[PDB]
Design a protein around this ligand. Sequence first.
Ligand SMILES: *C(=O)[C@@H]([C@@H]1N=C(C(=O)O)[C@@H](S[C@@H]2CN[C@@H](C(=O)N(C)C)C2)[C@@H]1C)[C@@H](C)O
Length: 268
Amino acid sequence: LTFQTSSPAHLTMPYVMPGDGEVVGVGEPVAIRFDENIADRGAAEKAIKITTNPPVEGAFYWLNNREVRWRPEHFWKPGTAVDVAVNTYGVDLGEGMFGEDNVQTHFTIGDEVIATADDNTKILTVRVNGEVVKSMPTSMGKDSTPTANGIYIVGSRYKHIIMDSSTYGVPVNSPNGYRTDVDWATQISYSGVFVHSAPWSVGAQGHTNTSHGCLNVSPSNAQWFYDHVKRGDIVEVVNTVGGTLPGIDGLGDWNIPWDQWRAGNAKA
Ligand SMILES: *C(=O)[C@@H]([C@@H]1N=C(C(=O)O)[C@@H](S[C@@H]2CN[C@@H](C(=O)N(C)C)C2)[C@@H]1C)[C@@H](C)O
């Protein structure tokens, strides 16, 4: 143990996800987010030791200047134990910025839970370890505001949340603007896509797309999703008229092809 002297305005703290001791889904990447921009990505990666059991090949990819992710080529095998040692204390992270402390977390992978939202059938089907446990009618984004296709990682969940168009730069008082109370909302993208309760589209669920891009389901089905789907589980959207979710979204990691992810984006 060696003390690292510091100087105000030249320290950055790492924050690691998922939580210590947590059980997460098969899509959960290791995430290390710093409270400052990181100039020397190579130094940061060198200081982070991720080990797995059973062992699988994984690699780092930076979503932006603040946050690096680590994942394998394919979804985790259930039961896998993951250990994360962020040994950044005193590490020069570039441009006079030094790691403020170390962090050490461990987590495990739970059941394989993959929910497929098929735009052609307008059914969201939840499969746990391969078996269908739930089929829910859904209404996705209308043609002018479609839901993006791709693999989404399940994030946070809310019993209630406010959808306010003003955080998207759109005044509430201008159709395309809105201030919506929503129950049972499960986040699937940082950009703001959720699976949530939508009593106002129950007639369209299973039939037509009427949403702004979110996956509208019934109140009971949304609560079910809130109760039974956890961080790191997967929602795959297929067959919409939209494009693909950006790989750097925050929950879109799996949309980046393995060869690109593995090659990384730290200087050679
Ligand atoms: C759920 O319906 C939310 C709604 N869904 C989306 C989405 O699917 O992207 C956004 S709509 C916004 C309009 N312009 C789009 C854009 O800038 N890009 C890059 C695709 C997104 C919004 C969060 C909300 C109504 O709860």
